Design a protein around this ligand. Sequence first.
Ligand code: NAG
Lengths: 50, 50
Amino acid sequence: LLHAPATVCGPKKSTNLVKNKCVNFNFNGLKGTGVLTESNKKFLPFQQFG
Amino acid sequence: VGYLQPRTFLLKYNENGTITDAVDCALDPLSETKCTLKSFTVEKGIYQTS
Ligand SMILES: *[C@@H]1O[C@H](CO)[C@@H](O)[C@H](O)[C@H]1NC(C)=O
């Protein structure tokens, strides 16, 4: 448990996607509450949140 | 070869998500007024800046 960010971990379990529902989303360290819908806004490939 | 030091940049983002312009907040006082107003265009007047 050396003083560094670790590179060996376990696979974090996932979930199927849900549309138009108040859910407790967790997108890579994004704890919170909201609903999920599709978007027409275009990103760049190195973005992940907004 | 150049150096990096802690200073503030006011950078704006395009509607497509990319960065098209940035302002050095400590280069010249007009840019410091642009940083304190959080806008790239200032109007005529007095701005108590720093
Ligand atoms: C934004 O991206 C769209 C997608 O193709 C393109 O048509 C448009 O010209 C782009 N606008 C700018 C200002 O880059």
